[PDB]
C-alpha cells in the first residue's frame, strides 16, 4: 500500500468524493457518513452518479438504525441500503433528486452567515414520495447495496478496503478540543467527552512524521479544513479504527 492515498484524486470521475455536506441541527452523523460513502461507492462501482438521500436514510430506516436525529448506528445504516435501498436527494433547498435534505444548514462551532446550529432537532417524517416534478417514483428511485460489512480494527485492512473499494464510514469519540479543529493532524489532549460521531474516511497520509486518516466531516465547508480534517492513524485514537463499516452496491 502507498504511503498516502486520497480517494478524491484516485477517482476523479466521482465528484461526490470531494463533497462536504451539512447535517444541520440534528444528530444524523450516522446517516451522513453512510450516504456520503455510499454515493462515492455507487460511482466507483458502476463507472452512474447519485447524490444519495440523507433524508431517506435519516427518516425511513427506523429502529434498525437507531433513533434518527437522536443518533444511530453506522452498520445499521448500510443494512438499510441493502434491505430497503436509498433514493436520491441533494442538499437542503437544492431541489436535486427524489428527497433533498429537509434540515437547514447552520454554523457548527464557527461564525458565519448562516444561523448557529442548535442541537435540538426533530427527526423528519419518513415520506415515501419524491419532490414535485421529479421522476421516477420513490420506489423506482431506490438504489440497493448488495452487501453490508464491518472492517476489523486493523490499520492495514482499513487502508486496503479504502484503496480497493473506496471511502468507508467510521466513528470516533468527540471531545471538545476537536470542535475547534482548523488544520494539522488532530490528537485529543483536552475537553469533555461530547459523544460518538460518525464520519467518512477517504484516505490517509503523513504530516510532519505523523500518520493520519483523511476525513470528511458533515458540518459544512466553513468548519475545519474546508469541511475535512485529519486525525491520528495507527493507534485507534479516540476509537477512529474501532467501528469501520462499508458495503458494495448491487451489480
Ligand atoms: C453523531 C452526531 O450527529 N453528532 C453531532 C450532533 C449534531 C447535532 C445534534 C447532536 C449531535 O450523535 C450522532 C450519532 O449518530 N451518535 C451515535 C450515538 O451516540 N447513539 C446512537 C444510539 C443512541 C446513542 C448512544 O448513546 O449510543 C451509544 C452506543 C455505542 C455503541 C453501541 C451501542 C450504543 C454514535 C453511536 C455514532 C458513532
Domain boundaries, the chain: 1-251
Helix 29-44 with 74-83: angle, nearest 10 deg: 50
φ, ψ for residue 211, nearest 5 deg = -70, 140
> How far apart (Å, rounded) are the C-alpha atoms in residues 183 and 192?
21
31 Cβ contact partners less than 8 Å away, ≥ 6 residues apart: 23, 54, 57, 58, 61, 65, 72, 77
> How far apart (Å, rounded) are the C-alpha atoms in residues 19 and 221?
9
φ, ψ for residue 164, nearest 5 deg = -90, -45
| 89 neighbors 101 (Cβ within 8 angstroms) | yes
DSSP conformation letters of 176-199: HHHHT--SSEE---S--EEEEEEE
Q: Is 71's C-beta closer than 6 angstroms to any atom of ligand 1?
A: yes
Q: Go through the chain and tell me how many residues it has.
A: 251
Peptide bond into 136 cis (omega under 30): yes
Q: Is 200's C-beta closer than 6 angstroms to any atom of ligand 1?
A: no
Q: Which atom of ligand 1 approaches the CA of 119 most closely?
A: 9
Percent helix, strand, coil in the chain, to 5, is 25, 25, 45
| 57 neighbors 35 (Cβ within 8 angstroms) | yes
130 Cβ contact partners less than 8 Å away, ≥ 6 residues apart: 87, 97, 98, 99, 136, 137, 138, 141
Closest residue CA from atom 11 of ligand 1: 27
From residue 119, give the alpha-carbon distance in Å to each of 17, 24, 83, 116, 246: 27, 9, 30, 10, 27
Q: Is 66's C-beta closer than 6 angstroms to any atom of ligand 1?
A: yes
Closest of 11, 30, 33 to residue 20, by C-alpha: 33
For residue 91, the 8-state DSSP code is: S
| 198 neighbors 28 (Cβ within 8 angstroms) | no
Which active-site residues does the annotation give? 29, 197, 217
CA torsion through residues 10, 179, 221, 87, sign: positive
DSSP β-bridge partners for residue 201: 168, 215
| 249 neighbors 147 (Cβ within 8 angstroms) | no
For residue 62, the 8-state DSSP code is: G
Tally the C-alpha atoms within 13 A of residue 87's C-alpha that lie toward its C-beta.
27
CATH top-level class of 1-251? alpha beta
Experimental technique: X-ray
Closest residue CA from atom 33 of ligand 1: 73
From residue 181, give the alpha-carbon distance in Å to each of 15, 81, 142: 25, 32, 36
Amino acid at each position: 500500500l502507498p504511503e498516502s492515498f486520497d480517494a478524491r484524486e484516485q477517482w476523479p470521475n466521482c465528484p461526490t468524493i470531494k463533497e462536504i455536506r451539512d447535517q444541520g441541527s440534528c444528530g444524523s452523523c450516522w446517516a451522513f457518513g453512510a450516504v456520503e460513502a455510499i454515493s462515492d461507492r455507487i460511482c466507483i462501482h458502476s463507472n452512474v452518479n447519485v447524490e444519495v438521500s440523507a433524508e431517506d436514510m435519516l427518516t425511513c430506516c427506523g429502529g434498525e438504525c437507531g433513533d434518527g436525529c437522536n443518533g444511530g448506528f453506522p452498520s445499521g445504516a448500510w443494512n438499510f441500503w441493502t434491505k430497503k435501498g436509498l433514493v436520491s436527494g441533494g442538499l437542503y433547498n437544492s431541489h436535486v433528486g427524489c428527497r433533498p435534505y429537509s434540515i437547514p444548514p447552520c454554523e457548527h462551532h464557527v461564525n458565519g452567515s448562516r444561523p448557529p446550529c442548535t442541537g435540538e432537532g426533530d427527526t423528519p417524517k419518513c415520506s415515501k414520495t419524491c419532490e414535485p416534478g421529479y421522476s421516477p417514483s420513490y420506489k423506482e428511485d431506490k438504489h440497493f447495496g448488495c452487501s453490508s460489512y464491518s472492517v476489523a480494527n486493523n490499520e492495514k485492512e482499513i487502508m486496503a478496503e479504502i484503496y480497493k473499494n473506496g471511502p468507508v464510514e467510521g466513528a470516533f469519540s468527540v471531545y471538545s478540543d476537536f470542535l475547534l479543529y482548523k488544520s494539522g493532524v488532530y490528537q485529543h489532549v483536552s475537553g469533555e467527552i461530547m459523544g460518538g460521531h460518525a464520519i467518512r474516511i477517504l484516505g490517509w497520509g503523513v504530516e510532519n512524521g505523523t500518520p493520519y486518516w483523511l476525513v470528511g466531516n458533515s458540518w459544512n465547508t466553513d468548519w475545519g479544513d474546508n469541511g475535512f480534517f485529519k486525525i491520528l492513524r495507527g493507534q485507534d485514537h479516540c476509537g477512529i479504527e474501532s467501528e469501520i463499516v462499508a458495503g458494495m452496491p448491487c451489480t
